[PDB]
Write a protein that binds this DNA or RNA. Sequence first.
DNA 1: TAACCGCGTTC
DNA 2: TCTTGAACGCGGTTA
Length: 1105
Amino acid sequence: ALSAQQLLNASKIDDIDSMMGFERYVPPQYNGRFDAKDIDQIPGRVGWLTNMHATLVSQEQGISGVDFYFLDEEGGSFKSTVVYDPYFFIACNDESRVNDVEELVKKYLESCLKSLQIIRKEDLTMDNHLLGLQKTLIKLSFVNSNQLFEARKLLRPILQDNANNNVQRNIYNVVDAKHLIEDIREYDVPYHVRVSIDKDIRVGKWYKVTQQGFIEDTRKIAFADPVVMAFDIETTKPPLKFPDSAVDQIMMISYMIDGEGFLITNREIISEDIEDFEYTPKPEYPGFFTIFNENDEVALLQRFFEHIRDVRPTVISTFNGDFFDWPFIHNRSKIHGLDMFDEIGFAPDAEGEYKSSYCSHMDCFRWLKRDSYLPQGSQGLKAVTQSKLGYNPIELDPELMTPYAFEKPQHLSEYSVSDAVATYYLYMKYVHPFIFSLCTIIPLNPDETLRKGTGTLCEMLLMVQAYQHNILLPNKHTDPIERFYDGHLLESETYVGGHVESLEAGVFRSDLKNEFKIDPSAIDELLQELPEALKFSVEVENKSSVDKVTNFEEIKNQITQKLLELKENNIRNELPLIYHVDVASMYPNIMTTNRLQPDSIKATCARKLKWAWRGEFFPSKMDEYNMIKRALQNETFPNLTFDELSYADQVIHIKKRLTEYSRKVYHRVKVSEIVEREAIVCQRENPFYVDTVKSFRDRRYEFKGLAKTWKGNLSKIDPSDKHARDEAKKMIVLYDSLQLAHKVILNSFYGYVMRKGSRWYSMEMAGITCLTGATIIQMARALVERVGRPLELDTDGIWCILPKSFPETYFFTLENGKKLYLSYPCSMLNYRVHQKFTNHQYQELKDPLNYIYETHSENTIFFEVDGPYKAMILPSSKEEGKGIKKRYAVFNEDGSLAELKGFELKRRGELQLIKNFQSDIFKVFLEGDTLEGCYSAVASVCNRWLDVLDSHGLMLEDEDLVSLICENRSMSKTLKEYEGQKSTSITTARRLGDFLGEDMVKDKGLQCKYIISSKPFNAPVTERAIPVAIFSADIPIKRSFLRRWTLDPSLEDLDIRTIIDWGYYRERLGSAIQKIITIPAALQGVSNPVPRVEHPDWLKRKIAT
DNA sequence: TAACCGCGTTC
DNA sequence: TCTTGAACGCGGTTA
Ligand SMILES: Nc1ncnc2c1ncn2[C@H]1C[C@H](O)[C@@H](COP(=O)(O)OP(=O)(O)OP(=O)(O)O)O1
Ligand SMILES: [Ca+2]
Ligand SMILES: [Ca+2]
């Protein structure tokens, strides 16, 4: 049956792979000893593994196996196949009768079963597993994965009535072979992952394919250089509209192959033959493009296809190729009578992405979305090239794409080529090293390593460890459709996450003094701890000993005297040191310190830790719940009766009906409560999980430290050596990229235990990680409060100021002449966290043969310092007593922007006016020589921006006004999925649809460019919202919609200037100028620097005193 | 006024 | 199907 298609597909894939240079290599037969240490002697072919896919194979029903795609040492390529029987396990609730269920499944599954076997694995949910006791399991093996699925289909009936009550007719009678099946296990492992794990094969490693299997050649390590292609397609476009692969044609396709550029053009659209040209944005990105002017598109497609066949690419990179370019070329190939999969072996898959068997499709957009660590407002190719490649790509407005086909083809070709350059070199210097290296530890191919969620990446890593330690995988987690608490249905339940505080606002600068009030008892405490904390820094922070340090006492006495000056003069007006302290990999290091794992949470090996639980429940109670349901049982349903509907479909009707009843009587739709819960953490459980976290943390620390090394080397580089300065700066962005790309995967080991379908779910374990972190950040803040003035706090980071005279940086001197770095403000914190948050109960197996553990003290929680900074600027809220958190600006000593966070300037969309405003104002806080002077200097910029708005934009030209006044906002789903909701995006989506057709809203992720109107008057802002595109429409079209939209049937004036509700914009900017300058200025004792923006009444009253 | 939502950041 | 988490700002509706 269904095998038919699979066997057919393989023959196809086999022929296309053969066409592209991968043909099955069957290694010679060897009757000599199979050790890895004789690899040179064993006959076989050595190659670099670049790809792997599951296949069926008819012998030399189909047989399951994995094709492996190799690049050989001699410049060629080949594939080799590994067969491996797929398998899962049957768990038994009576291990004395495994025999009987064994003989039962043997008969019952005769149709699909191949072989059967009794095994044993470690089960962390079984008592006495730490003493060597193991769970007995039946290993069912199959010829192919269809047979495996078939057995699952036959077992679940048994699995599902065993859960249901058995019906015994002889009521007067007080166990069957089928009821002994408790569960099946490891039944949902992707086959190629299973082969990849059980066989320890990884893409990116070198092997020698031999008769007895694959032998890793540890003597190579350096990756082979594959043939890499990257392409961009530019197409024709209806004015003010989206390209349609049904109507529109490809104008031109630009690509690059191992550094050499090319360019196809359809002369029917392009209207001019083009000639070889060069686009080399920077020396390190050479771009010589040869051009292939073609007559009809059909020839453009054939020529693109032809090349590919000649080049034999193993990697094809694009930029959003999965959802536009690849599909587009498909529809056009179909329309023009070409089958692309016969032409180049590419075709869409189940999720609609485009893959091939031999060549990986490397969509840079997927990397950027997951691993670039950039905001989504910075993930467009223009901005990515600036951040990561250090140059400005060529910018051409999409509306002018289609006409510039004729007016200036050569210009449009330059832009086409600019997209290709940026895509190839973005892939080659960021994606390709990261993904292929990742494959050497993660059992996926490049295509999957690029696209899988970071949680799944964590899961893959964890499954390797669990298998290699012979640990049985738990089945995927299943959230209950209904959960309750004190008789109330739970809308949602979670834990209290990170702790965040805004404590101050305003301007803080290295040349502008502040008041400090130092707690004298704080100085006493530090001095009591100074000797042991200094030893701590040397012994633990720098892994040395007090014996080889020679200036210990001077540094001590130096520190001691500065501290003593601060104890007497506790009231001081000094220049500040703007510092930031942040725990390195906080949550991971908290899990490793406390030996935290989902499997360590139990109900002395026991380390009791607290977390905070938070639930959201209906104030309704069981009585109300029981009633509403019966009501619902009586309605007829669209399709039916309520009981007829799926349990899920039932409860979702219930939830919508509960929200209404509770509001009527309870009057509150939901109730929030925080319960503190204590969980047991067994300090002796098999540590395979946390060890995986430990390993991946250390993997990241590798790159974070190299970033820090080269950030130091650039300081040593002399200003004149531009090449050196440039390379180091290039190394810094390289390692910052690599270390950030690991950060998300790393922290996903913490997320994973709350993820849906998690094989290792524990709400407790995540809760305890968060609450511990809240305790550590707050004890740190308590001390800096007593000795300085903290500014913002966020989970693990503290921005604070300190008196210039607070002990700062000191350098120990060693017997070796070497020096040890010491930041006193850092090590004073690090000593107290290590004295109050150390796990003295950490246990590990010392002797596995007799199960002897040693108990022990662990702690890897360290603050790290960056600073001192030149300026920090915190906004304040418009509301009394409140602050803005997760938003601020920081500046380095040289005047460069250190960090900008949270602000609209960084986010995607937002109103461009506030973007450009923020872009201009922040840097201005560096001027003036007094705080009052500084606010003045920024006030000048504010009034200038206030001027353009009070002038009703008569001040700057039209094409420049549309940008400043537009607000772009993306829309997660299609508008059809938003009804019952009102927003400026939702309106702009309808009006785009009405005027430009329903096609506009068919695809989600729409980006709604809108200005809001003055009319209708007193109408809600959501309703007075106009797509920008209308103002580029023909005058009759504009008038009809605008008058309709403004609700004035007689409006003749059709100028953007008249319609704009400049009032909205002034309020918006004012709130901006208010929170960033005016209100903050007051909290710093400065009378309103922008008097045209009025204060709030509460501030006026406190200003009034 | 306060609760609640979608989006997109900071952790 | 496949799928890391919680805390937060902001403009906007809604009770
Ligand atoms: N994307 C994320 N997913 C899950 N947890 C996260 C994420 N980002 C941050 N966290 C959590 C876990 C981190 O330990 C904690 C502190 O945030 P942050 O300081 O940005 O990261 P970090 O402390 O792990 O790395 P770093 O060494 O760069 O400080 O916040
Ligand atoms: Ca393009
Ligand atoms: Ca951190």
